[PDB]
Ligand binder design. Structure first.
Ligand code: NAP
Ligand code: NAP
Ligand code: 9L9
Ligand code: 9L9
Ligand code: CL
Lengths: 282, 282
């Protein structure tokens, strides 16, 4: 039966020393690390995830600066708001929760965040530096996945990884991180013409499509490592981007949904905020 | 027989347009566009390609500022030279010819070049922006390849492109550019297993390994589009990274070596320098 890649347990374990580090920094400097979170508009899921990230901050002795902007916020207004936070020495990391209202140029706003405070890893600069092996905060969800794979001793070098999805904050960074770990990487998307065929070749499959159980269980290679980065609420248990019912007979290891990639998205953001604060204050 | 993707003809065609644009610019402003070329050490191929790039500048009515630094140059010394060029308003583009002597942090020096003068497309920032669909000068060789494919009406969207090699200035940007053009993209490298099988699945193959004829002709899918980005001087005619002997029987279209990717590497650099000059002097 497949090894459950327990993101919930890993997140809990990691938070233990993050709390020690933060309490050390606060005792040393007399200053509390701050993650500024920006929630723009009325997306309920975005609201929920921002609160979860704030809670996680407080669990390790940090706090959040809660920035909430209306649905009709313009690109110019959000940029100004990010420039305030960039020049705020009391703020050590900046999160802009995706997806912002459609009228806003999200890419422009991501890129306005200073590299030093890009603790969610959304800037083009952060991405390019990561892709080229230079030190950078990685996009939270894919960096969290690499941590899951590494802590669970999952072999990556020489494996064929297939990433289904190519979004700026998930699929693309995921692909580059796996490449950096010496996987052969295939990147698929909505214009891939033979998706089932390619998924069946995957030693490591990452579902990053944001569509409930799009990736069929029948496409999964026997002994594959299965990573499901999706989450879709449903009556009595949500589902991810991959059909996981009966995956225990197929995968060598898999991320459950919930309790897999999700907690480690949050933990990665928090860890990288701790890192930023240490650099800023220490 | 296969379509010859004639990079030499395309380069000449592009240069005719660049010439009239440069002459118009000089007529309007009285100033000549300048590419600063930085050659560090005594590598023969590097000297040759920098000479060819300077020749191309003058063919289209521009000139080059030839910077030649010794073998023992330090990272700090090279950074200082690049910062002088960044601050010089008469210099519109900066080329650092790779590979610099190994004691130099080449990545750090690439990244010191201002985005506005990154006409060879070597910055992390430029790579990141291109990968995310934002405006930036593209790495010369892979951008030249995209142009070859486009201007020969080669179908890319929905095709499986396999890039063999993942270098910072070739393989990685090549893959991100093909992905932006809606190809399914597989990135291979020295740790890749079952390489012959992965190449056989490819609708578009890009050889970027810097090893003479590594990619074997029987690995190529019948009807594939074959792009060879290698060059290795040999008595009686140089060869690339792909066995191209009898390629006309196998490929639907192929870049010859020499006279394919090479000329378009040079012309892409010059075109992007003209663009930089047009912006700066307008
Ligand atoms: O907006 P959003 O909710 O789509 O999220 P998003 O932020 O656009 O990310 C969704 C990703 O999943 C990909 N995808 C969507 N449907 C797919 C399919 N049927 N097969 C393979 N890949 C697919 C998309 O391809 P594209 O990048 O081609 O949209 C995209 O890269
Ligand atoms: O130096 P240089 O001119 O070679 O440029 P380089 O900057 O070393 O890039 C050459 C690329 O070719 C790849 N490569 C070398 N041998 C290979 C092989 N046998 N099979 C598949 N990929 C291979 C390398 O893989 P790595 O990136 O794994 O070295 C690298 O990505
Ligand atoms: N900037 C930015 N925007 C984004 N939209 C994200 N994604 C971004 O927050 N995703 C996310 C998804 C699931 C969970 C999570 O922990 N989910 C729980 C399920 C609980 C629930 O969703 O009610 C789980 O999977 O265990 C946390 C974050 C991000 O990481 N950064
Ligand atoms: N920064 C930087 N460093 C680099 N090292 C390169 N590569 C970088 O100049 N390559 C290159 C390779 C071949 C040719 C070329 O035109 N080759 C001819 C052959 C010339 C001959 O036969 O002597 C051809 O393929 O037709 C031009 C540039 C680059 O583009 N940028
Ligand atoms: Cl809590």
């Amino acid at each position: 039966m497949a090894l459950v890649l327990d993101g919930r347990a890993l997140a809990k374990q990691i938070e233990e020393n993050l709390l020690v580090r933060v309490e050390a920094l606060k005792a040393k400097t007399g200053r509390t690390p701050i993650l500024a979170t920006i929630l723009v508009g009325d997306d309920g899921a975005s609201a929920t995830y921002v609160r979860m990230k704030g809670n996680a901050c407080r669990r390790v002795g940090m706090d959040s600066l809660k920035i909430e902007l209306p649905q009709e916020t313009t690109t110019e207004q959000l940029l100004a708001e990010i420039e305030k936070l960039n020049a705020n020495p009391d703020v050590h990391g900046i999160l802009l929760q995706h997806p912002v209202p459609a009228q806003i140029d999200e890419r422009a706003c991501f890129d306005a965040i200073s590299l030093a405070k890009d603790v969610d890893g959304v800037t083009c600069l952060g991405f390019g530096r990561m892709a080229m092996g230079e030190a950078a905060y990685g996009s939270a969800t894919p960096a969290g996945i690499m941590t899951i794979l590494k802590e669970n001793n999952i072999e990556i070098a020489g494996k064929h990884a297939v990433v289904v999805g190519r979004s700026a904050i998930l699929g693309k960074p995921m692909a580059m991180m796996l490449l950096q770990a010496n996987a052969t990487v295939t990147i698929c998307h909505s214009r891939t013409q033979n998706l089932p065929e390619l998924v069946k070749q995957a030693d490591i499959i990452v579902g990053a499509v944001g569509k409930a159980e799009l990736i069929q269980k029948d496409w999964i290679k026997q002994g594959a490592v299965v990573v499901d980065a999706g989450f879709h609420p449903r009556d009595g248990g949500g589902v991810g981007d991959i059909q996981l019912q009966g995956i225990e007979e197929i995968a060598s290891a898999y991320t459950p949904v919930p309790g897999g990639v999700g907690p480690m998205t949050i933990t990665t953001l928090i860890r990288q905020t701790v890192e930023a604060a240490e650099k800023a204050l220490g």
